[PDB]
Enzyme design. Structure first.
Site, PDB file in Angstrom:
ATOM      1  N   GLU A 196       1.623   0.379  -5.053  1.00 48.15           N
ATOM      2  CA  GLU A 196       1.172   1.659  -5.593  1.00 48.15           C
ATOM      3  C   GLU A 196       2.374   2.577  -5.523  1.00 48.15           C
ATOM      4  OE1 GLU A 196      -1.843   2.331  -2.542  1.00 48.15           O
ATOM      5  OE2 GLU A 196      -3.405   1.996  -4.058  1.00 48.15           O
ATOM      6  N   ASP A 218       0.863  -1.186   0.000  1.00 49.18           N
ATOM      7  CA  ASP A 218       0.000   0.000   0.000  1.00 49.18           C
ATOM      8  C   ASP A 218       0.904   1.243   0.000  1.00 49.18           C
ATOM      9  OD1 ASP A 218      -2.783   1.309   0.346  1.00 49.18           O
ATOM     10  OD2 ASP A 218      -1.821   1.992   2.217  1.00 49.18           O
TER      11      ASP A 218
END
Ligand SMILES: [Ca+2]
Ligand SMILES: [Ca+2]
Ligand SMILES: [Ca+2]
Ligand SMILES: [Ca+2]
Lengths: 359, 355
Positions: free
Chosen positions: A334, A305
């Site tokens: 990400e 994340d």
């Protein structure tokens, strides 16, 4: 002066109040033939990797509404064992047609769901339960339903009838439900190296470890798909000496968290309490955590994340380290701009060209 | 017994005789804010009484640091009281605050001597309550004379020791406060007869309604005192680590007493499981006042005061969503900082000095 749980805890009590001494290598914590469980899909070559077809799932999203799943297993890791369910059989057919990997939305220890059954109420249950747990519902536009012998699910379908942009009654009640529900994605880390207990039949003790492993075996053997665990090392759920969920900041204050250069306040760029993967011991924590999910949990890949908040050097270091336990491990995340380039070379889409780490 | 807060709130001191009994107003008689025809008290003179009151409300401690009438940071012992160090105690448990006792004039009698001709029966009832709030809501031990809750009067008797059943009368059937029942003893109050006549008829004698209004106010104040462990810290060190005041300095608004009590993380342990901090606001002024100090702070009036309603001392207190507090005239408010799911930062003290 306070008593804190272990950041390196591998087993916990209900609602992560106490750490538990455990041996993940114990047969008692293993489903039958766990030791000889292999990855159903290869990940050795770029051509092997390129074949990767991910299905990003959530524990409640999968079995919360499936009636063909025994009631006591709905919204649980064990739901994946319900071989004769619409959900299980659906995944079974998707796997057969080419879906190779299952990505699990937070299954580590989340903070945002009360693991005590009796301090929680879900829509499946009577409206009376909602009022007992939620003080707010007793003093709201829905207070009248505490008297009705109808469920929260029932009341919600009733509100649809007159729901409109000018009368958003469905979402108004939902907001209140949401405070005392079992539903959260889980991007709120309490303990990084313990499974979530609310997705277990009994969150007190080791039960969660065998159950989680049981779900892994079902996914790989019975559904024939690899496993990707969604990871959140970018933040902690809280910091400071008082929050119940502050673990790291209670043990080594001002170390594990990223602080503002002037004020020393914990930054909240990620939302929440920005962690510091740039610091040596937190980088060590991350690596050691991934080791456990790698060998003790038999996870095939990891999705970071807000990976842009991590230094590229850390991601590569962890990757080389994990590769010594499983050479075919996949890392991706990400890699958006995090605005941390003033501090270190960020693990971004641009910066990771040719590293092997996916974005 | 601490005479420091006593004299600041009551006005003047004992031995006062003649027109001095009117001239020497107190914070509670409206010294400065609502002066009487005989008053000549200066702004600094009035500010110094605020300084002594605050110190008293914080348990009259010798080491308690505060911002004086001139803006200087001063220890309690550094604040003067007629040549003496104002603050003297190590812990608030070593101090007994009071505004009425058997000896000397009753609180009501003192207000009757000291209040402006403009102060009607209704404001004088609140003046009694306001006077009592400084004791009832302060860190020191609360002491009071039997009858203060019933606006007790001795019809200006100073030394009622042998003034019998007549002057020392406490009507438990609540018809009157025993005010204007005769001229007091000539031997000891004759020298004050001219002052008594000047003030005696200024305002109506309390009745069943006024006594009931005062009892309600008294019960409110005591209920508040027992409503939080923050009001009664006991240890001097706790007082210093948690208690501070606003509306202090040279620029201060007269009659406004604002006390803050921390239960926040910087103080230490969470003493009140429900609160993060406390605010005591006493507006001993005829003009309504404003509190922008707690800018964006999420405060609420005490449940004790909210239950009271129109009969509350806080009746009319406004708390704007934007954290602004509007305090009506002659009012007392307990603004509380509710605790979240954990001890947050509350109302931390200046920590301007130690020792
Ligand atoms: Ca949990
Ligand atoms: Ca929830
Ligand atoms: Ca920065
Ligand atoms: Ca507290």
């Amino acid at each position: 002066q306070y008593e804190v749980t272990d950041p390196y805890a591998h087993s916990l009590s209900t609602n992560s109040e106490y750490s538990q001494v455990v041996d993940l290598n114990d047969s008692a914590l293993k489903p039958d033939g766990w030791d000889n469980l292999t990855m159903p899909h290869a990940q050795k070559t770029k051509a092997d990797l390129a074949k990767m077809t991910i299905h990003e799932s959530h524990i409640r999203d999968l079995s919360a509404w499936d009636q063909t799943v025994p009631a006591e297993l709905r919204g649980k890791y064990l739901a994946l064992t319900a071989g004769d369910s619409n959900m299980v059989q659906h995944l079974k057919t998707l796997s057969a047609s080419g879906v190779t990997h299952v990505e699990l939305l937070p299954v580590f220890d989340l903070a945002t769901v009360n693991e005590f059954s009796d301090k929680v109420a879900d829509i499946q249950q009577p409206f009376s339960r909602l009022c007992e747990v939620n003080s707010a519902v007793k003093s709201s536009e829905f207070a009248g339903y505490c008297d009705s012998g109808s469920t929260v699910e029932e009341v919600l379908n009733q509100l649809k009838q007159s729901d409109s942009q000018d009368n958003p009654q469905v979402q108004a009640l939902n907001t209140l439900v949401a405070q005392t529900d079992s539903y959260n994605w889980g991007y709120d880390p309490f303990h990084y190296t313990v499974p979530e207990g609310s997705y277990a039949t009994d969150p007190e003790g080791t039960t969660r470890i065998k159950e989680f492993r049981t779900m892994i075996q079902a996914i790989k053997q019975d559904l024939g798909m690899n496993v990707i665990m969604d990871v959140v090392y970018n933040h902690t759920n809280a910091a400071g000496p008082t929050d119940r969920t502050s673990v790291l900041d209670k043990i080594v204050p001002w170390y594990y968290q990223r602080l503002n250069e002037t004020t020393g306040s914990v930054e909240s760029a990620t939302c929440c309490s920005d962690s510091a993967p740039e610091h040596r011991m937190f980088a060590k924590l991350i690596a050691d955590s991934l080791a456990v999910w790698t060998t003790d949990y038999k996870i095939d890949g990891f999705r970071f994340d807000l990976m842009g908040y991590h230094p590229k050097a850390q991601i590569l270091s962890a990757w080389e380290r994990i590769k010594a336990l499983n050479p075919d491990i996949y890392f991706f995340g990400e890699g958006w701009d995090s605005n941390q380039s003033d501090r270190f070379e960020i693990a971004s889409q641009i910066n990771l060209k040719g590293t092997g780490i996916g974005t | 017994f601490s005479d420091r807060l006593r004299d600041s709130v009551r006005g003047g001191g004992p031995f006062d005789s003649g027109d001095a009994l009117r001239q020497n107003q107190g914070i509670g008689s409206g010294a400065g804010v609502l002066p009487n025809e005989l008053a000549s008290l200066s702004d600094d003179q009035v500010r110094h009484l605020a300084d002594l009151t605050r110190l008293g409300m914080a348990g009259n401690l010798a080491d308690f640091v505060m911002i004086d009438k001139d803006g200087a940071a001063k220890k309690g012992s550094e604040i003067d009281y007629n040549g003496a160090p104002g603050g003297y105690a190590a812990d608030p448990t070593e101090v007994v605050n009071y505004v009425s006792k058997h000896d000397n004039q009753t609180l009501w009698d003192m207000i009757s001597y000291k209040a402006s001709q403009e102060a009607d029966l209704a404001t004088r009832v609140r003046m009694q309550a306001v006077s009592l709030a400084t004791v009832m809501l302060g860190q020191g031990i609360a002491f009071d004379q039997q009858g203060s809750e019933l606006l007790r009067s001795k019809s200006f008797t100073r030394d009622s020791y042998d003034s019998g059943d007549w002057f020392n009368r406490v009507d438990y059937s609540l018809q009157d406060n025993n005010y204007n029942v005769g001229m007091p003893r000539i031997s000891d109050d004759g020298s004050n007869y001219e002052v008594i006549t000047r003030v005696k008829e200024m305002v109506a004698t309390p009745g069943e309604a006024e006594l009931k209004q005062m009892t309600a106010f008294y019960q409110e104040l005591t209920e508040l005192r027992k409503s939080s462990p923050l009001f009664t810290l006991g240890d001097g060190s706790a007082v210093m680590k948690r208690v501070d005041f606003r509306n202090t300095g040279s620029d201060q608004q007269a009659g406004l007493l604002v006390m803050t009590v921390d239960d926040g993380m910087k103080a230490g342990a969470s003493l009140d499981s429900r609160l993060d901090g406390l605010v005591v606001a006493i507006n001993a002024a005829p003009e309504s006042r404003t509190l922008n100090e707690f800018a964006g702070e999420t405060l609420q009036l005490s449940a004790i005061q909210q239950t009271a309603g129109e009969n509350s001392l806080a009746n009319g207190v406004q708390i704007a969503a934007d954290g602004t507090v509007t305090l009506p005239a002659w009012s007392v408010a307990v603004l509380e900082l509710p605790q979240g799911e954990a001890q947050g930062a509350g109302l931390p003290v200046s920590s301007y000095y130690h020792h």
